């Protein structure tokens, strides 16, 4: 089996890790933005869009990562081994769920186009030196 | 955040929850089924259904398990907190995806409506006592 | 004040005695069915029928003598006395309400016409000797015609 | 699984709450109404409305409750605990069925509409002070 | 900047400096009627009419100011500056909440004009002398 | 009681989270803009709309606030309290109070989706680092089209 988490959405694995790994922000950012933005379509019974069952899959998963964690917080004595699986799980899945939290929330909000309009964007603007390109990196706003 | 994983599909947690937790099968049947049914479809670039998205986070995120399982069967020394995590990985989380995955597959083969009747048929036939019911279990099939 | 459960809906309390003791499901089995198949109706603030109706009010009538079971525990010195409460409340008003669950459930998921029809056909496979009856009793399910 | 007993009706048991439980007649009253009533309704071979379900299906339950009283006054080897479950009953269990009784005869004598009304206009004279309340509390009247 | 609180809805302090201060109900009645009959509402995602916005913004005013004999009460570390302040915002900032619950909930309930007409029969009924006053004072109803 | 003040209005308490703390002007300088712009308006006997009916309330709740802070300068003796006591009202609360000003004043001024518009672009801006970030922040204004 190969499936690609972004190939029917139109991008791929290489391109959402053309950008530097710093530039995402926290899981708490993006869960509180999507709570404010959209809760209400998250919770109808309704296939709103083809991102809303992604959104929720991802979520639902995370929450039983959130339980592993804090059973393993009491169930295991050792603390060497207790940390270092907090801090993995922390760190390796959190680095993927961030990028597809970030991918889907963008997408809703600015279309999806536009995204990967600007992924391509940013992505030459980073490369090239800093005395032949505008001083004022892309940014992805509505209004004009 | 509330995400039932089912009400967008038209089920619910309670529903899927009526059936005996050992009614379901094994985690490598059902990706040997999916693999040798709809592996074609589930790689495509095209959004087929709402059922191939869910597959394929189901089966991305399942990678991810299996490749932390295979990591801290190495980096950790002691074989007592491994074991365990190991366990809880290969049973808790795998309880949840051998569901999820039973209904999906189901689902894409012998249609939704199918599977819901079905789910309400077999939580009555096995309630009532023995000798007031037909002998015969309820059983989804395609053929006359 | 002579009220029978089963009269308004067609029925009778002799009709529905023939079906034996052991027919019906227990309680906890009952209530998992009613909860995984109308939670959401059971709980509107809408009329649906007389159906949801009547259980809306058994299954409280029926949670108050649960609360009642515990009470006698942390109150009543004297195991006798506690366990004879517990028995009878368990076993006798606990076959009322396992009958009446049946019934109303039965309802709503066949038809009220094939419940009759299929007490009234039961009652003649039960009211006749083992030697000239056929081994299997009939089996509830619904017809096309309608 | 979370049941509001009028829920259906369109009250709450917060609406009920504005009441004081010394307001409520006794069973033995709101019985001999019932029965001077609505006598032959209830024992119609059909339903009505929904309030006939309802008070045919609690006046059932009260009857099976207080079969109860008379089994363990002979079945009981003790008079301490032959009396503390009598009490119970006949105590803690009489308040709902008090309660429940009065909203279901009120509604079929004056109107659903009415009995709301009332409860929020009782609510308005409960609240008040003493010193500014008046000595005749509302009534239900259908002159 | 000379703001009447209720200028926008067809009165002024003249007209309810008739009724006396003993005359209004505590805040936890009035905060339970609210809660029973408008809760759904006041937590709706849209505006209904200008008595939704102003009991919000009062009820957010109020918690406000809870949460500050809270935090005196664990922060100062003085007895009498600890029941002062406290009996001061229980006492005198309290007057004017109930007030305001009084009013926004009744003319929510009644109706405005009701409640103006109100106000000014109540008015008759204080001024009259003893000797003549009736026993009954005007009363609020709906039914 | 759950209540939120931007939720009639087509907005939520974590959208105007994002702003930091030191974007707001202080409280001086919002009541000037309010009393120069609608006194008028302000002090009418007639309903204009939600944002009106919304201001003509906190405006008040501070007022009290502002008495309260001057009472207890003559009735505690002792520094250390009414000092403690000033600074905590003349803080956390006047926070909150410019908060709501400038909303209510920003939506009156340039219109609703504007704002909403504003506050969904400066999120974007300020969840950046700033290694990649514009040097400059947006700036609220209003468009031709409407």
Redesign the interface.
Known sequence: ?????Y????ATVELLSFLPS??F?SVR?L???????Y?EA???????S?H??????????WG?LMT?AT??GV????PA??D??VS??NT??GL?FRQLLWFHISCL?FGRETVIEYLVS?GVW?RTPPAYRP???P??????
């Open positions: 089996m190969d499936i690609d988490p190939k029917e959405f139109g710093d530039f922000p950012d869960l509180d933005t999507a709570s404010a933005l809760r998250l919770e109808s019974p309704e296939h709103c083809p809303h069952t992604a959104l929720r899959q991802a979520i639902l998963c039983e592993l059973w393993v169930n295991l004595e050792d081994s207790r270092l699986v993995y799980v390796n899945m993927k909000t940013f980073i001083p004022n990196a940014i992805l706003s509505t209004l004009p």
